[PDB]
UniProtKB/Swiss-Prot annotation:
It is linked to Hemangioma, capillary infantile: A condition characterized by dull red, firm, dome-shaped hemangiomas, sharply demarcated from surrounding skin, usually presenting at birth or occurring within the first two or three months of life. They result from highly proliferative, localized growth of capillary endothelium and generally undergo regression and involution without scarring. Plays a major role in tumor angiogenesis. In case of HIV-1 infection, the interaction with extracellular viral Tat protein seems to enhance angiogenesis in Kaposi's sarcoma lesions. The lineage of its organism: Eukaryota, Metazoa, Chordata, Craniata, Vertebrata. Changing residue 51 to M: Loss of enzyme activity. It comes from Homo sapiens. It comes from the Eukaryota. The second and third Ig-like C2-type (immunoglobulin-like) domains are sufficient for VEGFC binding. ATP binds at residues 26-34, 51. This is Vascular endothelial growth factor receptor 2. Homodimer in the presence of bound dimeric VEGFA, VEGFC or VEGFD ligands; monomeric in the absence of bound ligands. Can also form heterodimers with FLT1/VEGFR1 and KDR/VEGFR2. Interacts (tyrosine phosphorylated) with LFYN, NCK1, PLCG1. Interacts (tyrosine-phosphorylated active form preferentially) with DAB2IP (via C2 domain and active form preferentially); the interaction occurs at the late phase of VEGFA response and inhibits KDR/VEGFR2 activity. Interacts with SHBSH2D2A/TSAD, GRB2, MYOF, CBL and PDCD6. It is found in: Cell junction; Endoplasmic reticulum; Cell membrane. Belongs to the protein kinase superfamily. Tyr protein kinase family. CSF-1/PDGF receptor subfamily. The gene is KDR. The modification Phosphotyrosine is found at residues 129, 188. N-glycosylated.
Length: 300
């Protein structure tokens, strides 16, 4: 622990506060707030999201945000993990942590907005389906999250709150894993129980294999175009009993048979019998390739 104590390469990370144009609020937490900004010369102009420590923060709050900064630095860069771009740590203003802005926001809300703009696959004339989501998009998002999680695992990380609300969508259909820190809201019971593996619910065990369970729930979210898990079910002791017994969600409205089986696999009762993220990357990549290449219309 005590990640805040890690060496800080200021030449790499430090960004001048006066090179930010602060814009609309994006969200608030115990730390302070996250606001949209345009940053000049952070890499040109680039839109970013800036998490800033509130004035009058406690030592523990301040330590927590610095720890977060150091954790993001330690993990390192991956396409599918929200990209840390800079920080403002020196005297003269608040502690600020700067990440890339993702135009389309969280994946759950985005997918929900596209329910009248989805077709399994385009057919010519394709302009009838301009900016529509397809199965190819959904498998692509799934593959990317698996890639991100594979990367996090290789960094010896465990996410602990994997869910569609914690995935951000940028341009060029690139998705990014984040942690909005909502554990520290209707998705959280005073714990994100709907996303938690049975060993996590009953025994507070968190491993990369419980993240795999959560990934299964995330897949269900994707292939339902942003529905809330376990429709029509109160999340109480009977829910937990039935989960232990082997009851699982039914196939969502937009799934393929293969994708549903993958959900079921992720939801194995035994952590060791669930696929690894490496296996998921392989499997999903193969499913994506098949999907992306199967229509030979334009390939005479
Ligand atoms: C609407 N578009 C958009 N684009 C980018 C960011 C946001 C955003 C909006 C409201 C609140 N937070 C937002 O972004 C963040 C998410 C998570 C953050 N923190 C975070 N801390 C993390 C630590 C670890 C990992 C792991 F990679 F392991 F998954 C991911 C983590 N994510 C942010 C930190 C600083 C600034 C923004 C952060 N919103």
């Amino acid at each position: 622990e005590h990640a805040e104590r890690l060496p800080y390469d200021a030449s790499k990370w430090e960004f001048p506060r006066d090179r930010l144009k602060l814009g609309k609020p994006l969200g608030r937490g115990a730390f302070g707030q996250v606001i949209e900004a345009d940053a000049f010369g952070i890499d040109t102009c680039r839109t970013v999201a800036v998490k800033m420590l509130k004035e009058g923060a406690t030592h523990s709050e301040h330590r927590a945000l610095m720890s977060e900064l150091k954790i993001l630095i330690h993990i390192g860069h991956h396409l599918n993990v929200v990209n840390l771009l800079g920080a403002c740590t020196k005297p003269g203003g608040p502690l600020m942590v700067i990440t890339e802005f993702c135009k389309f926001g969280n994946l759950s809300t985005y997918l929900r907005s596209k329910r009248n703009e989805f077709v399994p696959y385009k057919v010519a004339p394709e302009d009838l389906y301009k900016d529509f989501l397809t199965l190819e998009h959904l498998i692509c998002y799934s593959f990317q999250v698996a890639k991100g999680m594979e990367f996090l695992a290789s960094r010896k990380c465990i996410h602990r709150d994997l869910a569609a609300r914690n995935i951000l969508l940028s341009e060029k259909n690139v998705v990014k894993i984040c942690d909005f820190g909502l554990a520290r809201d209707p998705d959280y019971v005073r714990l994100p129980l709907k996303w938690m593996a049975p060993e996590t619910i009953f025994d507070r065990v968190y491993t990369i294999q419980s993240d795999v369970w959560s990934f299964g729930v995330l897949l269900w979210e994707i292939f339902s175009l942003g529905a809330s898990p376990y429709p029509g079910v109160k999340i109480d002791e009977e829910f937990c009993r039935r989960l232990k017994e082997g009851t699982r969600m039914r196939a969502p409205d937009y799934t393929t048979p293969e994708m549903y089986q993958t959900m079921l696999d992720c939801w194995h009762g035994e952590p060791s019998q669930r696929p690894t993220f490496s296996e998921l990357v392989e499997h999903l990549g193969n499913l994506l390739q098949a999907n992306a290449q199967q229509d030979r219309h334009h390939h005479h």
